[PDB]
Amino acid sequence: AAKVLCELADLQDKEVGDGTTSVVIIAAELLKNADELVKQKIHPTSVISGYRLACKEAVRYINENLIVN
């Protein structure tokens, strides 16, 4: 379960090359809360589709708060 976070930064290191540490903290805290959902009788499948849409709108709300050169 830890090696997933090792390859997490390797792909971020080649394309962007910065802020790879903050990528591991976001995913680390998401699973702490996601496991709490499973403790509340929530299947992981519904959590995956909800996270993908939360990530979809996250890029949109960023684009609606961008600044140009």
Binding site: Q12, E15, V16, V23, P44, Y51, R52, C55, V59
Partner: protein
């Protein structure tokens, strides 16, 4: 937030800017990796 003083700070006037490809790809890779760890639902040991 002003990291040197510990207060709020207007980044448009202070100049704390960041690229678009940083915050966007970080949230995608962090969400995609967490889906992988949570997609795992078994443990086999030989």
């Amino acid at each position: 937030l002003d990291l040197s003083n510990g207060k709020p700070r207007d980044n448009k006037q202070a100049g704390v800017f960041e690229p678009t490809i940083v915050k966007v790809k970080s949230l995608k890779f962090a969400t995609e990796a967490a889906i992988t760890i949570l997609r795992i639902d078994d443990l086999i040991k030989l």
